[PDB]
Amino acid sequence: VKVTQSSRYLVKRTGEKVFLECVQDMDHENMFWYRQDPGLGLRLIYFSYDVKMKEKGDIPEGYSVSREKKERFSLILESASTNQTSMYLCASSSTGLPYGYTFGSGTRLTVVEDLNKVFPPEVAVFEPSEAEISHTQKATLVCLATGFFPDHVELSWWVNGKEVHSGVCTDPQPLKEQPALNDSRYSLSSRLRVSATFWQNPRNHFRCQVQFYGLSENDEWTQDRAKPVTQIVSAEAWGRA
């Protein structure tokens, strides 16, 4: 029971033709492709009720679909436009069984007309204020993924080998480092808080992990800087008195 999609993020030039792959191990007759957009919910592009069989959904203009084996529902965009920038969600279901729809985790597609001016984040981490420790007896470390584009990062916190949710807050939307610039870079902040002792113990290990999704191997790079592939950029620190 898993609908799996090709990949989770994707960067593509205006005018390129695009293949979205959705696959399922469940032997399902029906597969659907939706796009999802802030404020317009989910809208159905195309569906398919058997091998080789497709049907327009509510918004197929600009899309074509391909059902070629029972397991795979590829979605094609003939000519990537900025307004096909979207979260694309695949779903699968059985005609007979009662369990309804299973959804894939999604894939976020950003189309930009740019010299693939995608940049990996730089990540800085900022030790706690000594003031906070005295006044509150808690200690807030801050992380800062900076200098990234498109808006394609997943920022996690890791302590002593284990990722931690309890104590963290990351912005839900990043800010434009340069708001005027049409395709400006973004930054994003996160905070991690623990007790003062946990921080004033040098056995404790504090790393800010940031996953960036940019370019894959197919993409071509000739520019005079490292290829901004999918990678992880991190910063770290330790307990201290």
């Binding site: 981490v125 900022f126 706690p128 204020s129 807030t140 620190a237």
Partner: peptide
């Protein structure tokens, strides 16, 4: 409280 933090990293 408004605090400052300047890592020296």
């Amino acid at each position: 409280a408004v605090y400052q933090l300047r890592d020296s990293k």
